[PDB]
Write a protein that holds these residues in place. Structure first.
Motif, PDB file in Angstrom:
ATOM      1  N   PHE A  79      90.697 -43.243   2.937  1.00 62.23           N
ATOM      2  CA  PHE A  79      90.717 -44.511   2.208  1.00 62.23           C
ATOM      3  C   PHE A  79      91.757 -45.395   2.876  1.00 62.23           C
ATOM      4  O   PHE A  79      92.951 -45.252   2.619  1.00 62.23           O
ATOM      5  CB  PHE A  79      91.058 -44.344   0.730  1.00 62.23           C
ATOM      6  CG  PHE A  79      89.987 -43.710  -0.101  1.00 62.23           C
ATOM      7  CD1 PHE A  79      88.673 -43.683   0.304  1.00 62.23           C
ATOM      8  CD2 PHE A  79      90.298 -43.195  -1.342  1.00 62.23           C
ATOM      9  CE1 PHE A  79      87.703 -43.113  -0.491  1.00 62.23           C
ATOM     10  CE2 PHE A  79      89.335 -42.628  -2.137  1.00 62.23           C
ATOM     11  CZ  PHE A  79      88.038 -42.591  -1.712  1.00 62.23           C
ATOM     12  N   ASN A  80      91.305 -46.336   3.689  1.00 64.52           N
ATOM     13  CA  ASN A  80      92.189 -47.275   4.358  1.00 64.52           C
ATOM     14  C   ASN A  80      92.308 -48.592   3.622  1.00 64.52           C
ATOM     15  O   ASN A  80      93.407 -49.124   3.496  1.00 64.52           O
ATOM     16  CB  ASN A  80      91.691 -47.530   5.775  1.00 64.52           C
ATOM     17  CG  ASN A  80      92.445 -46.749   6.788  1.00 64.52           C
ATOM     18  OD1 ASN A  80      93.205 -47.299   7.564  1.00 64.52           O
ATOM     19  ND2 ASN A  80      92.267 -45.452   6.773  1.00 64.52           N
ATOM     20  N   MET A  81      91.194 -49.176   3.220  1.00 66.17           N
ATOM     21  CA  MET A  81      91.253 -50.469   2.566  1.00 66.17           C
ATOM     22  C   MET A  81      91.837 -50.349   1.172  1.00 66.17           C
ATOM     23  O   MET A  81      92.565 -51.232   0.715  1.00 66.17           O
ATOM     24  CB  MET A  81      89.869 -51.075   2.551  1.00 66.17           C
ATOM     25  CG  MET A  81      89.427 -51.381   3.926  1.00 66.17           C
ATOM     26  SD  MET A  81      87.789 -52.021   4.046  1.00 66.17           S
ATOM     27  CE  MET A  81      87.840 -52.523   5.736  1.00 66.17           C
ATOM     28  N   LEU A  82      91.517 -49.280   0.466  1.00 62.94           N
ATOM     29  CA  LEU A  82      92.075 -49.110  -0.864  1.00 62.94           C
ATOM     30  C   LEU A  82      93.586 -48.939  -0.793  1.00 62.94           C
ATOM     31  O   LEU A  82      94.319 -49.467  -1.633  1.00 62.94           O
ATOM     32  CB  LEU A  82      91.370 -47.951  -1.561  1.00 62.94           C
ATOM     33  CG  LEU A  82      91.609 -47.811  -3.054  1.00 62.94           C
ATOM     34  CD1 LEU A  82      91.104 -49.009  -3.763  1.00 62.94           C
ATOM     35  CD2 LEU A  82      90.863 -46.616  -3.552  1.00 62.94           C
ATOM     36  N   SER A  83      94.075 -48.196   0.197  1.00 64.59           N
ATOM     37  CA  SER A  83      95.512 -48.062   0.389  1.00 64.59           C
ATOM     38  C   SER A  83      96.153 -49.396   0.729  1.00 64.59           C
ATOM     39  O   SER A  83      97.280 -49.668   0.318  1.00 64.59           O
ATOM     40  CB  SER A  83      95.798 -47.084   1.508  1.00 64.59           C
ATOM     41  OG  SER A  83      95.182 -45.854   1.258  1.00 64.59           O
ATOM     42  N   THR A  84      95.479 -50.228   1.512  1.00 64.40           N
ATOM     43  CA  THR A  84      96.026 -51.540   1.807  1.00 64.40           C
ATOM     44  C   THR A  84      96.112 -52.378   0.550  1.00 64.40           C
ATOM     45  O   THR A  84      97.049 -53.154   0.383  1.00 64.40           O
ATOM     46  CB  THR A  84      95.191 -52.243   2.855  1.00 64.40           C
ATOM     47  OG1 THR A  84      95.148 -51.440   4.025  1.00 64.40           O
ATOM     48  CG2 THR A  84      95.788 -53.562   3.210  1.00 64.40           C
ATOM     49  N   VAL A  85      95.119 -52.289  -0.323  1.00 64.39           N
ATOM     50  CA  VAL A  85      95.183 -53.018  -1.590  1.00 64.39           C
ATOM     51  C   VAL A  85      96.370 -52.545  -2.407  1.00 64.39           C
ATOM     52  O   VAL A  85      97.165 -53.344  -2.913  1.00 64.39           O
ATOM     53  CB  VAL A  85      93.871 -52.822  -2.366  1.00 64.39           C
ATOM     54  CG1 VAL A  85      94.043 -53.159  -3.813  1.00 64.39           C
ATOM     55  CG2 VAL A  85      92.789 -53.637  -1.752  1.00 64.39           C
ATOM     56  N   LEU A  86      96.493 -51.234  -2.563  1.00 70.85           N
ATOM     57  CA  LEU A  86      97.606 -50.675  -3.318  1.00 70.85           C
ATOM     58  C   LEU A  86      98.935 -51.111  -2.733  1.00 70.85           C
ATOM     59  O   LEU A  86      99.889 -51.364  -3.468  1.00 70.85           O
ATOM     60  CB  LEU A  86      97.489 -49.162  -3.332  1.00 70.85           C
ATOM     61  CG  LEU A  86      98.295 -48.402  -4.359  1.00 70.85           C
ATOM     62  CD1 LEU A  86      97.627 -47.088  -4.637  1.00 70.85           C
ATOM     63  CD2 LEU A  86      99.657 -48.152  -3.839  1.00 70.85           C
ATOM     64  N   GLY A  87      99.009 -51.228  -1.412  1.00 64.61           N
ATOM     65  CA  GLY A  87     100.247 -51.640  -0.775  1.00 64.61           C
ATOM     66  C   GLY A  87     100.531 -53.113  -0.953  1.00 64.61           C
ATOM     67  O   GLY A  87     101.675 -53.502  -1.154  1.00 64.61           O
ATOM     68  N   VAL A  88      99.518 -53.956  -0.779  1.00 62.51           N
ATOM     69  CA  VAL A  88      99.668 -55.398  -0.954  1.00 62.51           C
ATOM     70  C   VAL A  88     100.032 -55.769  -2.380  1.00 62.51           C
ATOM     71  O   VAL A  88     100.556 -56.857  -2.625  1.00 62.51           O
ATOM     72  CB  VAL A  88      98.385 -56.132  -0.548  1.00 62.51           C
ATOM     73  CG1 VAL A  88      98.482 -57.561  -0.952  1.00 62.51           C
ATOM     74  CG2 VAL A  88      98.182 -56.026   0.921  1.00 62.51           C
ATOM     75  N   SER A  89      99.682 -54.936  -3.354  1.00 68.82           N
ATOM     76  CA  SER A  89     100.074 -55.262  -4.718  1.00 68.82           C
ATOM     77  C   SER A  89     101.578 -55.439  -4.863  1.00 68.82           C
ATOM     78  O   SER A  89     102.013 -56.157  -5.761  1.00 68.82           O
ATOM     79  CB  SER A  89      99.599 -54.183  -5.672  1.00 68.82           C
ATOM     80  OG  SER A  89     100.192 -52.955  -5.358  1.00 68.82           O
TER      81      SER A  89
END
Lengths: 553, 712, 545, 50, 51
Positions: free
Chosen positions: B385-395
């Motif tokens: 999961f790359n994009m989901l991790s980026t979302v979680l990080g950008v939050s």
RNA sequence: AGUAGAAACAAGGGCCCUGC
């Protein structure tokens, strides 16, 4: 003939099997696609390595067998091998061969009657070549270049179509017996199909190749690139040889490929019908749709319907927007406030009411947005990145190249944000007559101030004065803007910054379905207006060539 | 004299020369100890000891979410998440973008998941087959899973993604599964464990971060749900501006530049900014799927009741995964003459003959172990999961508070997966430090760590992000993309045009200079001539091809028209890099040569399908490997041959099967029969066919129909 | 109606939406994921801690409301039990890097560079293959005059090397470049020394106790020291070589605009400067010899062959006076031998053996792996001759990459052209010849002072750096070059008065020094990086001595 | 693409789309049903035929 | 059939018909005429004093 | 012997086959 009988025998043998029968019996024909994937699946990690390591063999290529016998291609021509009877493991109907065999064919092999058809199969690339030959280069010079990044088209293309309109066009020109029911695009564009068909008929061709090439011939290749100078598909196709960050290969490339002329013609026609329909008072919507569908225009050789070109173009202008809106055409999220262009980067808000006194005491409602938002803005050769906050222009940065453009862009931004006291107490020069209603149609106070600025330059000077003026602090001398639009001064405007180097146009591959009112003002799921009829030029006379307004009005 | 190249870094900048450091001109460098260490680090970072027992597998289940303990050395990684804080961050992000945001995104995703065909699972990297328990390509794995479904209960009539997903769900409740093999069947428990399994692949194609030395490969019963989650995650990520994962190249540069201008314009006269280049550590070993489950539950809260059930699968399946230990240990004597080899399922047996290191690393993970697999109930793996991790990080980059504003402090930045850039703003160093510590704290509450060695900071305009160094200018390293200037490896027709296109894009984006491009052009031409064993005519080289070349060269009259693969010279340059040579030479070839080359009836030409090239006799295909000739992989070749026979016949009748995908209500046999009869009439009416031949054809076809319908 | 429905059906079938999902009947209007029995059993088991059933978690997430204050409290609490260090470099300076300790790192490249001696002849186009050139050099008689003796100056296993050399000459004389598998070749080629397998199903405790079968003890490499012969190599590979054209290159295409004239001109000057050095002849040697070995490995596996180490060049061009049209040359540096390169799979290994000719006696520190012999005499007057001999290996990957050793040119040209255009743009004039002839670049130190020379002459240092990166690349060099950027970014921040800071610099230095082991390039560059920061400390802060 | 309404607009008149859209909003059904309704509605319309 | 700069001549013919239709014999755009008249000779000039 | 790195190679399948 005998081949047909062979196919029949093959089908029979295949049905005699048990699994093949079940798979040819269940489901619809679409399964073919699925079956096409479960077979012949094999990849490699580093094809370069395996190419240098594969071509080092004796017989590294495969090839047909019957085609070689029929062509009488021998083996061991001059003590050098050309092929050997074997069976590749995958095909089972191909035979190993060597690279030398290819050269043998090219030098003493069977010749087809003619091959000038190639120039048609690959029309786009011979077109590149031809346009190139007609360029007149010039000296080369060295300097820094202001390259702005943005989305552009790199392929000059006439009659840009959609994808559904090509998958069918690829049938009526190549595989007509297997063609589907006639779609509207075909019945309407008959001459086009006839044209593409006359060239690829009764010719020896590989059709898969031709079909792919047709897809390429109708594609404007859209790219997000750094760019400098004019924007034309003819330049974008060879931008690599016109300039980089530090050099410029001067060359004149103005008279070739005639693309933007068609687009400006289309916009002129759209403005015409939009104004005409505006002449009405109660049916501008239906009047406009009727005027649209009752019109046609010539493109090169073919005759096209207007409503068909409008749903294919991508001109983000306040005229094309309205038409594409009447016809239910989706479109991008680009705004427009008069001559400038705008695009939102972030932020939000919602409408709010306020009033102003025109002369003495005359309350007039005007709206604004109650939140902070950030915007890219584009006037002729000038860019800006600004922010609004609750009826105020918080900050702004500019990256243009002219003083006049800088002043006009700043002014239209101040208006767009309702910044200043004028929106609090209008000037004496304006009156209730200039307010609105040329013939009854009101005018929001925004466009009122807009035209008041465009009327006289001194109004523009006064509006800029509405912005605070202060003394240029130390160090900021370079990043400051006077009233004339000078990159530095002793006293400059308030909360303004200049810089050399345009701003990067934002990007979003999004689409939105908007609508419009009886006054021809489009809305986007909110009270924001993306287009209108007050933001386009007043009027002008033009002589349209190759147009058909077969409608009474 | 003593030489020192680094001395050039005194009188010159460092970015304008940083590419010189990259040693990309040489080959980059190429188990179970690694996997065991990874399993161990994952179980440790969860700073807790609570455990339950799974009624399904009856294995201890370490629960690491909202159970933080052992709060010492937080500077070191931590993999516990506080769902409360996670939802708070998600809510703030939604508030920023506006309401109806997540709902709109799941709607856009659902609009695609439904119409998607289930054959798009063939495209993608390798997967782990659950019948042979080895890595096949995705196409073959899908074929085998479908074949098992069919042989167990009945043929798979489904044609879309949702139907395939429902069939998978049902297969988790069967009691005996069948499949083909050199026709074994298995029970429920064994198949369940065999489905949740995950394998590893040592490809790690790109050098990039040397830490990446493996990559995950889930099965085929987990692929469709992962696609669903990634589709919604992409639809979310594209909208945000503080994310750079989906975008590429000029897009992320433009993002950074607008961000910097906006920053410098916002901050007042009493504030100054600072930048930081961060590289999170242990990224795939701290991300927890339980937090993903909670977050996906919060996102899909107002949408339809279908998406609520689909998105929640891939999280639970990754919350119950088993890992694969590979190839086991090796035993040997002193002289190393002999050598015994041992596998994973046996290491539990000879646990006394191993180094003390393996014993300290293995016995602790002996209860979680089952036959040659370990029950890792959390953590993650690379690439899942790359994009989901980026979302979680950008939050996090969106956070704001009352305390940060009471002091006039605020941060922003831009993050791609485990690589970020931070821009902090404040009025004094005591407050810059305080802001930076606050950001680090909010990131620790949700498992996002930070590497203290690899991370550094400075005053505003000097940072790095994904091998792109930034200052007033942008230094295109141009060594990052150096390896691409090599023959692609397809055929002769293609490689030269492909190389020229790569040079062109580089000149446009990465600012490759003119003379360098000319040098690269000449180098690539020489490498092409060397690969395909061909050289010019004027040269004196001897060998296979040059023999026949020199033989028939006399028949030519204008060598300027020959092709490089036929002893031709180079006629192309900077201003004509956008033009294939076949086009640049067509007006000068000899009609004889020209016609023999561009002949459609060649025993060599094959189409590949981007492919901006010309097709001709030189567009050949290489031989196929033959190592399998010895391997007993032939039973599987049988079914492939069957599918190939059917498809090539269908295409023999209908020529547009590949260009235009078939559609209609007929089956394949019906369509074939009907079309054959129609063509028979069409010809017999006018063309060269006799009534005898027509009747024979019709009889053959009716018999074939009878046989097809009679077999079953 | 029927016509409309036909069009609609075609569209839908084309979009894959002609299914029960989008066109349901009255009944089948409830599409839903078929939640089974096992899957539900799992989902209620994978829940976070406070909850125990997916229903509770879903109700807690669907109704979650924001409470900013408790969030701020938890953030601050976490911010207090962490204590993230922040360290401005100016205050916390960088110690020097600590190279390992032990013997010196010896020569590692397969071929000799400075001590290599060559026999030259004129090249005739008819005889151009390697297997032929190796014979032409054999007829003139010099290759046969060689005859080492049984007493080596240094090394091990001298008898095997001697017998192998005799067999090599014999094989060349028979015009068949093949060698037989006898005891000598079998020992030097490692033919039969692959481990023997013993299945466990046939294993027992008695077998283990009979012959100890412990787990193999991987013996990681041992450290080394700074090499003192590396600077000599770097200075030798910078000078001209009396010939040119060592590395083959293609032709220049035509030109139509000034841009292409500029491109051709600059490319010609630079290539003319580089083609004459010694680094170039080493590149050409690698290109051609590895090409030959690669072909042999493809065609004749399972067979020991004989491949020369050679190169082709062209004598320099004097003025029109004297003999015009200088001739070409085939040069021979030694002999190489392969051994059954059955590269069934990538990354494999096929040992080879190298017999090279030299006229310079060896050093124990540098030429450790070699086994040198006193061969005889050769001319120049008469001078002794030596024969360096060893054994080593290669693989598919190293073959593929060494053969593609012309990338060094691309990188070097890139650096130089960038500098020149950047200087030319700031002044809006052609300052290319001026920037190449005038702009000076620091090279090194001599007698404690710095040295500088024009860009036109500094190119050679960068070229040699790139070639060495191509040669000595390994994981160690990979990690080192990856960890030095942090230091250079710190340095640049120091040069521009940007007050840098970091979170844990000691850890960075430790990571760097972890990857310094027995690799001449890494050790050399580490010493030079220390010296850089030292030399700059005379002009900048943030570095300790 | 990107929404069932945009898909349905491909072969229906945008008017019938707006009608079926308001209808599905009234009943609050899954908006994947914009398509059937538009189709059904248009048939009825072209059955009137003025 | 035989020619050198077909695109310029063709576009210029289109511009001529356009001009004639508009009842004004002038041609506004100066791209094709400029090229075809300047193909013979056109260049910069450096002052002798700056040499 | 040697190579390389934190594990693998120093042929593998049935006298014959081969090099993703």
């Amino acid at each position: 003939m005998s081949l047909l009988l062979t196919i029949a025998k093959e089908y029979k043998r295949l049905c005699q099997d048990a699994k093949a029968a079940q798979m040819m019996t269940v489901g619809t024909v679409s399964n073919y696609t699925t079956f096409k994937k479960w077979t012949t699946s094999r990849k490699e990690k580093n094809p370069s390595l395996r190419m240098r390591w594969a071509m080092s063999s004796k017989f590294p290529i495969i090839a047909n067998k019957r085609m070689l016998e029929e062509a009488q291609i021998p083996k061991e021509h001059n003590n050098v091998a050309l092929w050997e009877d074997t069976e590749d493991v995958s095909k089972r109907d191909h035979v190993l061969a060597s690279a030398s065999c290819i050269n043998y064919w090219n030098f003493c092999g069977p010749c087809v009657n003619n091959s000038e058809v190639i120039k048609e199969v690959y029309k786009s690339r011979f077109g590149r070549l031809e346009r190139r030959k007609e360029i007149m280069w010039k000296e080369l010079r060295f300097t820094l270049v202001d390259r702005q990044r943005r989305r552009v088209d790199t392929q000059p293309v006439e009659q840009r179509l959609r994808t559904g309109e090509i998958k069918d066009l690829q049938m009526w020109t190549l595989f007509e017996d297997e063609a589907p029911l006639a779609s509207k695009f075909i019945l309407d564009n008959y001459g086009l199909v006839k044209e593409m068909r006359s060239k690829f008929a009764n010719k020896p061709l590989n059709k898969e190749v031709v079909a792919h090439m047709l897809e390429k011939q109708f594609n404007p290749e859209s790219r997000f690139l750094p760019v400098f100078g004019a924007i034309r598909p003819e330049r974008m196709e060879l931008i690599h040889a016109l300039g980089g960050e530090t050099w410029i290969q001067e060359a004149n490339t103005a008279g070739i490929s005639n693309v933007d002329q068609r687009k400006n013609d289309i916009r002129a026609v759209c403005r015409k019908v939009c104004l005409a329909a505006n002449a009405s008072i109660m049916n501008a919507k239906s009047k406009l749709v009727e005027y649209i569908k009752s019109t046609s225009m010539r493109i090169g050789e073919t005759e096209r319907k207007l409503e068909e070109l409008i749903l294919e173009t991508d001109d983000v202008s306040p005229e094309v927007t309205l038409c594409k809106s009447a016809l239910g055409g989706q479109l991008g999220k680009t705004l427009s406030f008069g001559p400038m262009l705008l695009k939102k980067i972030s932020g939000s808000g919602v409408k709010v009411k306020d009033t102003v006194y025109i002369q003495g005491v005359r309350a007039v409602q005007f709206e604004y947005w109650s939140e902070q938002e950030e915007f890219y803005g584009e006037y002729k050769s000038a860019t800006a990145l600004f922010s609004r906050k609750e009826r105020s222009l918080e900050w702004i940065t500019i990256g243009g190249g002219i003083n006049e453009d800088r002043k006009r862009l700043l002014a239209m931004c101040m208006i767009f944000c309702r910044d200043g006291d004028y929106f609090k107490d209008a000037p004496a020069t304006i009156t209730m007559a200039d307010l609105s209603t040329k013939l009854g149609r009101e005018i929001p106070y925004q466009y009122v101030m807009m035209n008041w600025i465009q009327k006289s330059e001194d109004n523009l000077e006064a509006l800029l004065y509405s912005r605070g003026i202060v003394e240029t602090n130390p160090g900021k001398m370079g990043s400051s803007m006077g009233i004339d639009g000078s990159k530095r001064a002793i006293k400059s405007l308030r909360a303004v910054t200049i810089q050399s180097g345009k701003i990067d146009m934002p990007e979003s591959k999004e689409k939105i379905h908007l609508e419009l009112s009886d006054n021809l003002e489009a809305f986007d799921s909110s009270g924001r207006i993306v287009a209108t009829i007050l933001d386009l030029p007043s009027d002008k006379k033009v002589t349209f060539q190759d147009v058909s307004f077969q409608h009474p009005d | 004299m003593e030489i020192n190249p680094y001395l050039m870094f005194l009188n010159n900048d460092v970015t304008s020369l940083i590419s010189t450091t990259y040693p990309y001109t040489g080959p980059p460098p190429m188990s179970t100890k690694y996997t065991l260490e990874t399993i161990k680090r994952t179980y440790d970072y969860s700073r807790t000891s609570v455990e339950k027992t799974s009624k399904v597998f009856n294995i201890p289940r370490r629960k690491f979410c909202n159970c933080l303990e052992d709060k010492d050395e937080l500077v070191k990684p931590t993999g516990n998440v506080d769902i409360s804080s996670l939802l708070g961050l998600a809510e703030m992000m939604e508030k920023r973008m506006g309401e109806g945001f997540f709902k709109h995104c799941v709607m856009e995703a659902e609009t695609e998941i439904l119409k998607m065909h289930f054959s798009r699972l063939t495209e993608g990297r390798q997967t782990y087959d659950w019948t042979s328990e080895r890595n096949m390509p995705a196409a073959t794995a899908l074929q085998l899973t479908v074949d098992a479904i069919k042989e167990t209960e009945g043929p798979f009539k489904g044609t879309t993604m949702l139907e395939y997903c429902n069939k998978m769900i049902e297969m988790l409740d069967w009691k005996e599964i069948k499949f083909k093999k050199v026709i074994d069947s298995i029970k429920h428990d064994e198949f369940l464990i065999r489905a949740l399994t995950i394998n590893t692949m040592a490809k790690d194609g790109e050098r990039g971060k040397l830490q990446r030395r493996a990559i995950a490969t889930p099965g085929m019963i987990v692929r469709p749900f992962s696609k669903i989650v990634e589709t919604v995650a992409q639809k979310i990520c594209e909208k945000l501006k503080e994310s750079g994962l989906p975008v590429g190249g000029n897009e992320k540069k433009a993002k950074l530049k607008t961000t910097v201008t906006s920053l410098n314009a916002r901050m007042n006269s009493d504030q100054f900014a600072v930048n930081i280049t961060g590289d999170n550590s242990k990224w795939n070993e701290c991300q927890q799927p339980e937090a993903y489950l909670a977050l996906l539950a919060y996102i899909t809260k107002d949408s339809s009741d279908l998406m609520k059930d689909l998105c929640s699968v891939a999280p639970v399946l990754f919350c119950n995964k088993f890992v694969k230990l590979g190839q086991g240990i090796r035993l040997s004597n002193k002289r190393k003459t002999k050598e015994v080899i041992i596998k994973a399922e046996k290491m539990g047996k000879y646990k006394n003959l191993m180094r003390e290191e393996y014993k300290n690393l293995f016995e602790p993970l002996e209860k979680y172990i089952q036959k040659d697999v370990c029950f890792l109930p959390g953590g993650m793996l690379m690439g899942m999961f790359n994009m989901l991790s980026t979302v979680l990080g950008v939050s996090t980059l969106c956070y704001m508070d009352e305390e940060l504003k009471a002091k006039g402090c605020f941060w922003t930045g831009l993050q791609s997966s485990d690589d970020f850039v931070l821009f902090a703003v404040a009025s004094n160093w005591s407050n810059i430090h305080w802001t930076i510590r606050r950001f680090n704290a909010v990131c620790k509450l949700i498992g996002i760590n930070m590497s203290l060695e690899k991370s550094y900071g400075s005053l505003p305009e000097l940072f790095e992000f994904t091998s792109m160094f930034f200052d007033g200018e942008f230094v295109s390293n141009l060594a990052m993309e150096l390896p691409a200037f090599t023959t692609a490896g397809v055929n002769e027709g293609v490689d030269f045009t492909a190389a020229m296109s790569i040079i062109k894009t580089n000149m446009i984006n990465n600012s490759l200079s003119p003379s360098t491009a000319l040098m690269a052009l000449r180098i690539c031409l020489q490498e092409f001539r060397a690969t395909y064993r061909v050289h010019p005519w004027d040269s004196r080289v001897k060998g296979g091809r040059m023999k026949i070349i020199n033989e028939f060269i006399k028949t030519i009259e204008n060598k300027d028209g020959l092709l490089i693969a036929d002893g031709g010279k180079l006629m192309n340059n900077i201003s004509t890099l956008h033009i294939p040579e076949e086009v640049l030479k067509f007006e000068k070839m000899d009609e004889q040569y020209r016609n023999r080359v561009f002949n459609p009836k060649n025993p060599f030409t094959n189409f590949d399908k981007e492919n901006e090239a010309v097709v001709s006799t030189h567009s050949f295909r290489t031989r196929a490997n033959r190592t399998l000739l010895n391997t007993d992989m032939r039973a599987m070749m049988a079914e492939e041959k069957r599918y190939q026979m059917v498809c090539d016949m269908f295409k023999s009748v209908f020529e547009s099967a590949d260009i235009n995908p078939p559609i209609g209500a007929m089956s394949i046999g019906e369509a074939i029969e009907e079309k054959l009869l129609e063509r028979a009439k069409m010809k017999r009416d006018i063309g060269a066919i006799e009534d005898s031949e027509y009747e024979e054809i019709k009889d053959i076809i009716r018999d074939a129909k009878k046989a097809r319908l009679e077999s079953r | 109606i029927f016509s409309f429905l036909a069009t609609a059906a075609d569209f839908l079938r084309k979009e894959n939406m002609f299914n029960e999902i989008f066109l349901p009947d009255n009944e089948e209007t409830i599409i839903e994921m078929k939640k089974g029995k096992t899957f539900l059993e799992l989902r209620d088991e994978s829940v976070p801690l406070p909850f125990q059933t997916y229903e509770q978690m879903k109700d807690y997430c669907e109704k979650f409301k924001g409470n900013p204050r408790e969030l701020a409290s938890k953030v601050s609490q976490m911010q207090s039990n962490i204590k993230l260090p922040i360290k401005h470099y100016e205050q916390n300076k960088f110690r020097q890097i600590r190279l390992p300790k032990g013997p010196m790192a010896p020569y590692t490249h397969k071929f000799l560079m400075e001590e290599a001696w060559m026999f030259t002849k004129i090249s005739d186009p008819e005889r151009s293959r390697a297997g032929e050139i190796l014979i032409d050099f054999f007829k003139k008689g010099n290759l046969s005059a060689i005859r080492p003796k049984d007493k080596p100056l240094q090394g091990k296993y001298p008898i095997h090397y001697k017998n192998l050399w005799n067999q090599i000459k014999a094989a060349i004389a028979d015009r068949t470049m093949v060698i037989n598998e006898n005891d000598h070749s079998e020992f030097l080629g490692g033919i039969g020394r692959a481990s023997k397998k013993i299945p466990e199903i046939s294993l027992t405790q008695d077998v283990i106790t009979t012959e100890g079968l412990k787990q193999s003890e991987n013996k990681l490499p041992e450290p080394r020291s700074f090499p003192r012969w590396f600077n000599a190599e770097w200075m030798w590979a910078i000078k001209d070589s009396d010939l040119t054209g060592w590395v083959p290159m293609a032709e220049y295409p035509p030109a139509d605009n000034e841009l292409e004239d500029y491109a051709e001109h600059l490319n010609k000057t630079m290539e003319g400067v580089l083609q004459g050095t010694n680094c170039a002849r080493e590149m050409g040697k690698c290109i051609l010899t590895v090409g030959a070995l690669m072909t042999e490995c493809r065609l004749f596996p399972g067979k020991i062959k004989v491949v020369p180490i050679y190169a082709r060049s062209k004598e320099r061009k004097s003025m029109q006076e004297g003999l015009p049209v200088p001739s070409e040359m085939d040069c021979l540096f030694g002999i190489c031998v392969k051994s059954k390169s059955h590269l069934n799979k990538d990354d494999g290994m096929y040992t080879i053996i190298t017999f090279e000719f030299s006229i310079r006696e060896p050093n124990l520190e540098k030429h450790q792996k070699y086994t040198v012999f006193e061969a005889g005499h050769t001319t120049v007057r008469e001078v002794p001759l030596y024969l360096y001999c060893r054994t080593t290996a290669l693989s598919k990957i190293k073959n593929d990459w060494l053969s593609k050793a012309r990338r060094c040119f691309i990188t070097t040209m890139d650096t130089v052209e960038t500098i020149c255009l950047r200087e030319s743009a700031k002044a809006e004039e052609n300052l290319v010849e001026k920037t190449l002839n005038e702009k000076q670049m620091w090279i090194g130190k001599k007698n404690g002072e710095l040295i500088a020379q024009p860009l036109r002459e500094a190119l050679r240092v960068q070229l040699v750096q790139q070639f060495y990166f191509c040669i000595y690349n390994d994981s160690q060099l990979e990690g080192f070059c990856n960890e030095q950027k942090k230091i250079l970014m710190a340095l640049e921040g120091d040069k521009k008065n940007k007050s840098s800071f970091g979170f844990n610099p000691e850890g960075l230095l430790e990571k760097i020094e972890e990857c310094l082991i027995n690799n001449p390039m890494c050790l050399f560059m580490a010493q030079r990086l220390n010296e850089l920061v030292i030399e700059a400390s005379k002009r900048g802060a943030k570095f300790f001595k | 693409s990107k929404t069932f309404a945009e898909i349905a607009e491909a072969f229906l008149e945008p008017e019938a789309v707006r009608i079926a859209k308001e209808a599905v909003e009234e009943y609050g059904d899954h908006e994947r049903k914009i398509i059937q309704i538009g189709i059904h509605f248009q048939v009825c319309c072209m059955f009137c035929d003025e």
